Amino acid sequence: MASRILLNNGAKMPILGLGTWKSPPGQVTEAVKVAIDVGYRHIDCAHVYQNENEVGVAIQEKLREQVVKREELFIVSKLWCTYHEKGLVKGACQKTLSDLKLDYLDLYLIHWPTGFKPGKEFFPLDESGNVVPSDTNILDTWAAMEELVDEGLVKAIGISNFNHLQVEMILNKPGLKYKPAVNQIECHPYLTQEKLIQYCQSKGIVVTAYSPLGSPDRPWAKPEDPSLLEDPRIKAIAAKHNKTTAQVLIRFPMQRNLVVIPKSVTPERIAENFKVFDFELSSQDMTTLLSYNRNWRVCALLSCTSHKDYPFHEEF
Numbered sequence: 001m002a003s004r005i006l007l008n009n010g011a012k013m014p015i016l017g018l019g020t021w022k023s024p025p026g027q028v029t030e031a032v033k034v035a036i037d038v039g040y041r042h043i044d045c046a047h048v049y050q051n052e053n054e055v056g057v058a059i060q061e062k063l064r065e066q067v068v069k070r071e072e073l074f075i076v077s078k079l080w081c082t083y084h085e086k087g088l089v090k091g092a093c094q095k096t097l098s099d100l101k102l103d104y105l106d107l108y109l110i111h112w113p114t115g116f117k118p119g120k121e122f123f124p125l126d127e128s129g130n131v132v133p134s135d136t137n138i139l140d141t142w143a144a145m146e147e148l149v150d151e152g153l154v155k156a157i158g159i160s161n162f163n164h165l166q167v168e169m170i171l172n173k174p175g176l177k178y179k180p181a182v183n184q185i186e187c188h189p190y191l192t193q194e195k196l197i198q199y200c201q202s203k204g205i206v207v208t209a210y211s212p213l214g215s216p217d218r219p220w221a222k223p224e225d226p227s228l229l230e231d232p233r234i235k236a237i238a239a240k241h242n243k244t245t246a247q248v249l250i251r252f253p254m255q256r257n258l259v260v261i262p263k264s265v266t267p268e269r270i271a272e273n274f275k276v277f278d279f280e281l282s283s284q285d286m287t288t289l290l291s292y293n294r295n296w297r298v299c300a301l302l303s304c305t306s307h308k309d310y311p312f313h314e315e316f
């Protein structure tokens with residue numbers, strides 16, 4: 001299968017990208033350089049990751065070296081929760097553009113549906129430890145995202161961590177100008193997301209699967225938690241196909257018509273993770289992997305469960 005998926009803005013998005021959350025700033029420049037050298041054409045970024053300057057150094061060097069042309073890259077970033085105010089969206093986008101050393105983004109996402117009080121802190125707290133919300137809703141933030149398209153700063157806009165009712169809310173927005181192109185959500189064999197994926201795809205919204213390997217480097221990992229990479233059933237499917245477990249975990253969402261964004265800063269794994277276009281999981285393999293769902297989340301935004309727009313109380 002094909003390397004890119006067509007978005008509802010008419011542009012094509014590479015189905016494999018490199019994730020950068022937790023990629024240390026002293027390692028991510030080489031990670032992105034290696035990724036581009038071995039074929040990656042999509043990098044998933046965010047201001048909250050604090051490493052966009054270093055990602056940008058790599059992008060700029062590979063453009064300067066003429067390893068790739070800008071039109072061949074698909075660079076994604078995300079608007080942090082403390083910038084949901086309509087007067088802050090442009091500046092947030094522009095800071096990301098300046099750090100990534102880009103004149104446009106291919107895709108800019110609302111990182112979470114939850115808006116927080118603006119300020120220096122990414123998670124502003126009250127004296128009791130609750131995250132302080134913003135009163136700006138998802139629809140006014142969306143209008144501000146639409147303006148970025150109309151100013152040439154971004155080619156596509158989308159959402160991330162939106163539940164089905166929140167997707168619907170955008171789709172039903174009075175005066176909607178641009179539909180979301182993408183909803184980026186956690187998705188892997190333990191969180192298969194069957195209901196939300198079907199909804200989004202039925203509406204022409206492409207889904208990107210994050211944490212496809214189960215984010216073994218997440219900072220809140222516990223010994224007892226389920227581990228995709230170590231799951232012998234998944235290992236068995238990998239062995240049958242003469243591939244690694246990670247390669248199965250990456251190919252899985254691809255065959256669901258998803259985009260997938262595994263993260264690594266290890267050169268060998270960056271290359272490994274890209275060598276997924278030369279085998280096929282059977283339908284039986286796909287059904288089997290889907291059967292491992294247990295509604296287990298890496299990213300539950302646990303500090304924000306009272307926020308009015310917290311996404312994960314809703315079944316989907």
Ligand SMILES: NC(=O)c1ccc[n+]([C@@H]2O[C@H](COP(=O)([O-])OP(=O)(O)OC[C@H]3O[C@@H](n4cnc5c(N)ncnc54)[C@H](OP(=O)(O)O)[C@@H]3O)[C@@H](O)[C@H]2O)c1
Nearest residue numbers: 019020021210211212213214215217246262263264265266
């Ligand atoms: N929109 C959102 O809210 C959101 C949330 C979470 C994630 N994301 C995006 O999705 C990306 C991927 O998710 P993630 O970073 O949570 O986790 P992930 O991609 O599921 O897993 C990354 C971890 O797996 C390791 N790894 C990578 N390839 C491997 C391989 N072939 N064999 C063994 N281990 C391997 C990495 O180690 P090394 O790096 O040490 O090689 C790292 O510890 C993020 O980086 C970010 O770009 C977005």
Ligand SMILES: NC(=O)[C@@H]1C[C@@]2(NC(=O)NC2=O)c2cc(F)ccc2O1
Nearest residue numbers: 021022023024048049217218219220
């Ligand atoms: N939630 C986050 O995005 C960061 C990630 C991380 N920060 C980072 O650079 N790598 C990481 O895993 C981190 C590391 C920690 F030890 C504790 C919290 C924490 O939170």
